Amino acid sequence: KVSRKSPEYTTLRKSCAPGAIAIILAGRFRGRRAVILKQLPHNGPLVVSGPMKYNGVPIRRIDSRYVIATSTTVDISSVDTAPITAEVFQRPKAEKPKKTLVSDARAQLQKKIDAALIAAIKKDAQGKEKAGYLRSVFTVKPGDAPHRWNW
Amino acid sequence: QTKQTALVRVENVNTREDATWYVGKRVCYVYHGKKVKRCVRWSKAPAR
Amino acid sequence: VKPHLRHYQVVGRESPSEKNPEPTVYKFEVFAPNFVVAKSRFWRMMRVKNKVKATHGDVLSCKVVKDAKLVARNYLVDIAYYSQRCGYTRMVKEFRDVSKTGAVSQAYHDLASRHRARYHNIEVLNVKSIPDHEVKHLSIAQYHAPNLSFPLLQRRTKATRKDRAIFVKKNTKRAVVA
Amino acid sequence: KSHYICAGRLVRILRGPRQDRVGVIVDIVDANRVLVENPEDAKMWRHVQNLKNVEPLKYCVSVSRNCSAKALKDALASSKALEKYAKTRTAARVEAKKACAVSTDFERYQLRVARRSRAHWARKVFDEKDAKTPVSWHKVALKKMLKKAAKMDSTEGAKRRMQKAIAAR
RNA sequence: GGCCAGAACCAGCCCUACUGCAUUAUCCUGUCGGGGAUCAAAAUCCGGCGGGCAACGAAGUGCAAGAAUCUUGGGUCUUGGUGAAAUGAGCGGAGUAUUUGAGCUGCGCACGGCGCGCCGCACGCACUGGUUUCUUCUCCGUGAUGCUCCAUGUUGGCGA
RNA sequence: UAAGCCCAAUUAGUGAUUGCCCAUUAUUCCUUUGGUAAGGGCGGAAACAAAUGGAGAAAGUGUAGCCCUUCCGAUGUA
RNA sequence: AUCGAAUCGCCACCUACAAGACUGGAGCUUGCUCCCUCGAAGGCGCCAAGUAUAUUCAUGAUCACAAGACA
Ligand SMILES: [K+]
Ligand SMILES: [K+]
Ligand SMILES: [Mg+2]
Ligand SMILES: [Mg+2]
Ligand SMILES: [Mg+2]
Ligand SMILES: [Mg+2]
Ligand SMILES: [Mg+2]
Ligand SMILES: [Mg+2]
Ligand SMILES: [Mg+2]
Ligand code: NA
Ligand code: NA
Ligand SMILES: [Zn+2]
Numbered sequence: 001k002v003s004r005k006s007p008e009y010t011t012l013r014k015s016c017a018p019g020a021i022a023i024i025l026a027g028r029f030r031g032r033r034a035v036i037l038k039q040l041p042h043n044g045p046l047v048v049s050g051p052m053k054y055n056g057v058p059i060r061r062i063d064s065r066y067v068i069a070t071s072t073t074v075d076i077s078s079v080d081t082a083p084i085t086a087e088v089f090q091r092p093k094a095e096k097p098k099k100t101l102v103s104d105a106r107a108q109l110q111k112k113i114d115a116a117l118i119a120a121i122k123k124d125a126q127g128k129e130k131a132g133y134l135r136s137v138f139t140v141k142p143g144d145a146p147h148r149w150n151w
Numbered sequence: 152q153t154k155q156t157a158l159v160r161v162e163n164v165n166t167r168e169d170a171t172w173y174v175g176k177r178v179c180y181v182y183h184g185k186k187v188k189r190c191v192r193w194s195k196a197p198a199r
Numbered sequence: 200v201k202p203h204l205r206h207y208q209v210v211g212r213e214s215p216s217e218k219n220p221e222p223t224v225y226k227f228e229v230f231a232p233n234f235v236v237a238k239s240r241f242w243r244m245m246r247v248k249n250k251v252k253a254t255h256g257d258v259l260s261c262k263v264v265k266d267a268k269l270v271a272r273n274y275l276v277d278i279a280y281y282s283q284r285c286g287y288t289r290m291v292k293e294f295r296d297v298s299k300t301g302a303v304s305q306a307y308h309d310l311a312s313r314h315r316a317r318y319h320n321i322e323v324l325n326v327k328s329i330p331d332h333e334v335k336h337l338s339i340a341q342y343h344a345p346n347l348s349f350p351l352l353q354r355r356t357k358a359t360r361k362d363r364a365i366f367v368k369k370n371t372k373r374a375v376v377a
Numbered sequence: 378k379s380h381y382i383c384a385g386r387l388v389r390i391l392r393g394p395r396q397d398r399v400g401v402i403v404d405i406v407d408a409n410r411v412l413v414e415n416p417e418d419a420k421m422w423r424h425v426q427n428l429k430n431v432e433p434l435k436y437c438v439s440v441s442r443n444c445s446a447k448a449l450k451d452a453l454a455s456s457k458a459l460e461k462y463a464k465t466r467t468a469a470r471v472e473a474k475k476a477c478a479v480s481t482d483f484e485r486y487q488l489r490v491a492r493r494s495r496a497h498w499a500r501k502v503f504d505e506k507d508a509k510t511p512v513s514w515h516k517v518a519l520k521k522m523l524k525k526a527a528k529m530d531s532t533e534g535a536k537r538r539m540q541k542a543i544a545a546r
Numbered sequence: 547g548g549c550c551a552g553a554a555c556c557a558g559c560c561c562u563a564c565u566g567c568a569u570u571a572u573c574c575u576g577u578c579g580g581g582g583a584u585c586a587a588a589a590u591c592c593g594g595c596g597g598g599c600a601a602c603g604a605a606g607u608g609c610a611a612g613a614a615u616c617u618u619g620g621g622u623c624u625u626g627g628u629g630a631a632a633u634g635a636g637c638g639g640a641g642u643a644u645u646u647g648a649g650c651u652g653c654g655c656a657c658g659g660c661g662c663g664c665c666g667c668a669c670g671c672a673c674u675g676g677u678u679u680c681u682u683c684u685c686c687g688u689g690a691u692g693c694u695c696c697a698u699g700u701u702g703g704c705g706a
Numbered sequence: 707u708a709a710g711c712c713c714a715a716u717u718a719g720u721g722a723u724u725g726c727c728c729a730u731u732a733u734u735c736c737u738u739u740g741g742u743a744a745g746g747g748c749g750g751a752a753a754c755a756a757a758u759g760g761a762g763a764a765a766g767u768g769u770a771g772c773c774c775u776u777c778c779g780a781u782g783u784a
Numbered sequence: 785a786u787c788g789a790a791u792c793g794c795c796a797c798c799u800a801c802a803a804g805a806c807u808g809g810a811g812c813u814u815g816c817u818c819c820c821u822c823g824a825a826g827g828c829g830c831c832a833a834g835u836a837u838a839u840u841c842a843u844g845a846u847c848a849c850a851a852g853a854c855a
């Protein structure tokens with residue numbers, strides 16, 4: 001029913017729902033657990049901000065194919081997630097030719113989102129255990145059979 | 152032999168059902184040459 | 200495993216004509232892997248006994264007789280097999296099984312192993328469940344004892360297929376290579 | 378001693394669709410087959426099992442060959458074979474295997490921290506005991522070296538070297 | 547960028563997950579008797595009689611047409627594309643209807659059992675019968691005034 | 707406790723009738739080539755300069771084949 | 785010192801032995817009963833030296849040999 005050209009159209013699988021906890025399978029933060037916040041419009045990539053305080057993962061977009069969305073979720077209806085738009089990750093063109101540099105607006109968005117995400121985790125009955133879950137690092141051990149596991 | 156198709160044995164994968172789970176997954180063979188040649192993020196990440 | 204031979208009843212007759220306005224109807228019991236083989240055996244028996252060919256006959260029915268409830272029984276199987284050296288040899292054997300099809304399938308396996316007789320040279324004359332007191336072979340009657348008990352010795356227990364391993368530590372269950 | 382295949386013997390199914398289920402021998406067909414049934418299990422109606430696929434347990438209920446379903450159920454409930462089996466370690470191991478098989482990533486994390494917590498506290502208790510009664514390699518090595526070291530250090534020259542090079546520090 | 551790579555969708559194919567009709571009687575039960583074997587039973591086994599659905603994850607028995615749309619399966623580095631004529635149950639509009647099947651039943655005729663028309667009819671044929679109790683989506687829509695070929699995405703890497 | 711011989715199965719008394727591996731074979735897709743080949747188009751429709759949508763369009767056995775669509779065959783000594 | 789490399793689980797609890805017609809231990813009734821540590825785990829390691837009051841992680845911008853690797 002929804003138009004395929006609309007920003008609201010999506011095909012994302014159900015497991016990668018907002019609030020779910022995802023395992024990062026690739027990139028700089030491989031093996032880290034993170035929290036799925038939203039999907040960018042036009043069937044875009046997911047946006048994960050598994051709190052940087054817990055594991056160092058900032059507000060970053062990631063393709064859903066490079067993540068394992070576990071069945072363990074967190075109610076994040078209290079998180080706004082509205083200011084996280086496609087414009088946040090856009091970058092100006094570079095013309096023809098040590099603490100990390102983060103723009104002030106990006107820093108404020110990270111501050112507000114993480115604070116609300118942490119508060120929602122605290123509100124959870126298993127929040128302290130889930131906070132430790134977010135700190136845990138996933139790795140493939142000798143003898144592991146990931147193809148046989150439930151997630 | 153037909154070299155266009157490779158056969159890979161993966162540890163802890165001993166059933167056909169187990170191998171079905173890995174269909175479509177990315178596979179990488181790592182080796183080294185003699186000289187340092189161009190790679191991904193050659194300019195962005197010189198440490199690579 | 201479930202038996203490889205199914206119990207078939209084939210009802211057929213010679214096609215009606217002017218010389219035989221109401222041909223006799225014949226009923227046949229056969230243990231065949233499928234109904235096509237069952238009909239083939241029926242028409243062979245009609246040709247050799249009643250002088251009726253398949254090209255001049257009708258198959259009224261060809262249906263499987265279901266097995267009864269699985270009960271440890273003794274089956275008397277009257278069977279015969281052909282060989283070039285000895286012609287037709289007929290024997291009456293007893294088997295321990297839970298069904299007619301299992302007992303007949305066991306008899307066919309026994310004939311193949313101990314006499315090199317294939318399916319198409321074997322004729323099953325009869326098969327029926329018999330009481331304990333009518334069993335003559337001690338190898339069969341030894342299972343009629345009210346207190347039959349024995350250990351399980353010299354058994355090769357293979358692990359489940361998912362957990363099977365190539366190299367395992369000597370006195371542990373840890374799979375080094377699996 | 379090994380448990381015999383007899384009428385009433387309780388068995389566990391080793392492999393197949395009924396893997397790790399319990400039944401009663403009920404009847405013996407031949408040297409290779411039996412007729413297993415368990416009223417309390419949903420999938421364990423009376424069926425034929427090969428003797429290579431069954432593990433004879435230690436419990437035997439008092440039934441006759443080819444007994445009725447009611448007679449088997451009464452004998453099983455009276456003998457308390459299933460209740461007695463549930464308390465053993467093998468039954469707990471079988472149940473724990475299913476828990477691991479259906480576990481999620483969160484449950485795997487919970488087991489990992491629980492095992493590590495036990496591992497940490499085992500190290501604490503071992504250290505407390507090993508300080509008093511030396512059993513580890515380093516404490517044993519220290520306890521053997523201590524007597525000779527004290528004799529080697531109780532000399533005037535040892536005192537001078539110790540004091541001079543310590544006050545220098 | 548006419549290079550490398552990853553995700554998206556579109557069409558076509560290629561693999562699958564989801565199953566209904568018929569059949570079952572040498573069968574299933576209860577009971578009496580026999581027969582059996584026990585310390586005593588029970589069971590295997592044979593008859594008479596009374597009931598029947600071993601029952602849809604009963605049977606490994608015959609045939610299966612179950613719209614990957616509802617309910618977002620996998621693959622396509624084994625195809626071509628990013629809308630340069632998207633013929634779609636899939637795209638666009640319009641309306642809560644349409645008639646497929648299943649149940650339940652009217653008349654006639656066929657069909658089966660009994661010897662003239664009587665009984666039955668599993669529900670066959672015609673009335674495109676009726677009841678809508680359950681189950682469905684339904685209808686309409688774009689010629690080339692394009693003879694032919696080529697030319698229209700997204701995200702990074704590399705290239706200033 | 708065959709990796710031998712005879713028989714019988716396809717993950718097994720559970721609930722149905724395709725275990726797996728190898729062809730210059732089969733099906734299907736792309737390309738070439740040749741047909742006893744099958745069809746369509748070929749009376750330039752209109753409009754459109756550069757600075758800043760394009761190009762072609764041959765009445766044809768055979769060419770860089772007039773163009774397009776479609777179907778079938780394709781090895782081979784003398 | 786060329787030299788950039790492929791390898792990706794550590795241990796001072798496995799790293800001793802032997803038997804699968806049967807080695808946790810008894811009884812006699814010899815296949816059953818009873819006792820036990822109940823006969824189906826080598827220990828750790830997988831991100832707070834431990835299960836809590838925590839804590840710097842980004843701009844390496846969405847995959848790319850882990851851009852590091854003395855556990
Ligand atoms: K041609
Ligand atoms: K010409
Ligand atoms: Mg012992
Ligand atoms: Mg369907
Ligand atoms: Mg529509
Ligand atoms: Mg293009
Ligand atoms: Mg099966
Ligand atoms: Mg030629
Ligand atoms: Mg590297
Ligand atoms: Na070819
Ligand atoms: Na061709
Ligand atoms: Zn017993």
